[PDB]
Design a protein around this ligand. Structure first.
Ligand code: GUN
Length: 262
């Protein structure tokens, strides 16, 4: 099913970012995404976290995790496959084509990456007191057709910096990649050791990612945390309702992580 009139970012208008409705390009982009994620269904192949609760919270002492700010952005998978073949995919499976957002190859800046699929969200940051869209790279499923998604989270984060972010910065500072003519900025999401979650909540929640490998669908492994208050499908919301009866206070969390901490 197609969604006509799809919006890339409610509010701000982004030139260079237009929804793909033409075929076969639409089915090709979607198909390629599903194959990279090894998803069989038809919906969003991307990974779906689950709200933290007094039960799965124990997973933090059972294996290595990383944490980071839980922004209020729009989820989007970015399929980078060749020059002028940069596409954004949302939860509704809508596809948007992005013009002038180049992704050079680490070894040959005149080359362009392909068979690459990033995962992250779209945010509307305020710079100099003005709306400016940014894409935060959370994960990376496939790099140049390589199953980097199967690697630990550590390696995937390095791949993004080393393979995606670094090359782009090189061509901007050396070649002709004007960050002002680009549709939006591409910055990497930053993760830290969970034994410092506290520091992140002082300056809107947290998200705990395990070192395991990328997995599409529902990941009861990935825990997103949101204050008991301001805490918003039926089955999905069902885990949000019973979560209100026995909520994980910011204290319960920190205290738990401190107990676990080495
Ligand atoms: N793992 C993961 N969690 C998210 N939470 C919001 N966006 C994302 C994402 O792209 N990946």
């Amino acid at each position: 099913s197609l969604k006509l009139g799809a919006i890339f970012l409610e509010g701000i208008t982004v030139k260079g970012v237009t929804q793909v409705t033409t075929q076969p390009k639409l089915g090709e982009v979607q198909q390629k995404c599903h194959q990279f994620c090894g998803w069989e269904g038809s919906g969003f192949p991307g990974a779906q976290p689950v709200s933290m609760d007094k039960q799965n919270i124990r997973l933090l002492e059972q294996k290595p995790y990383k944490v980071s700010w839980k922004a209020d952005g729009t989820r989007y998978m970015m399929l980078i496959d060749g020059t002028n073949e940069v596409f954004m995919i949302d939860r509704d499976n809508s596809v948007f084509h992005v013009s002038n957002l180049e992704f050079p190859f680490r070894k040959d800046l005149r080359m362009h990456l392909s068979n690459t699929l990033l995962d992250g969200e779209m945010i509307i940051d305020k710079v100099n007191g003005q709306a400016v869209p940014r894409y935060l790279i959370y994960d990376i499923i496939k790099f140049n057709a390589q199953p980097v998604g199967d690697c630990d989270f550590n390696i995937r984060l390095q791949c993004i910096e080393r393979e995606i972010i670094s090359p782009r910065h090189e061509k901007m500072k050396t070649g002709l990649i004007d960050k002002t003519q680009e549709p939006f900025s591409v910055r990497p999401k930053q993760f830290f050791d969970i034994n410092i979650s506290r520091k992140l909540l002082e300056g809107d929640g947290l998200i705990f990612q395990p070192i395991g490998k990328y997995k599409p669908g529902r990941c009861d492994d990935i825990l997103k945390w949101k204050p008991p208050s301001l805490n918003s499908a039926y089955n999905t919301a069902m885990a949000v309702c019973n979560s209100i009866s026995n909520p994980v206070t910011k204290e319960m969390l920190f205290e738990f992580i401190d107990r676990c901490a080495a």
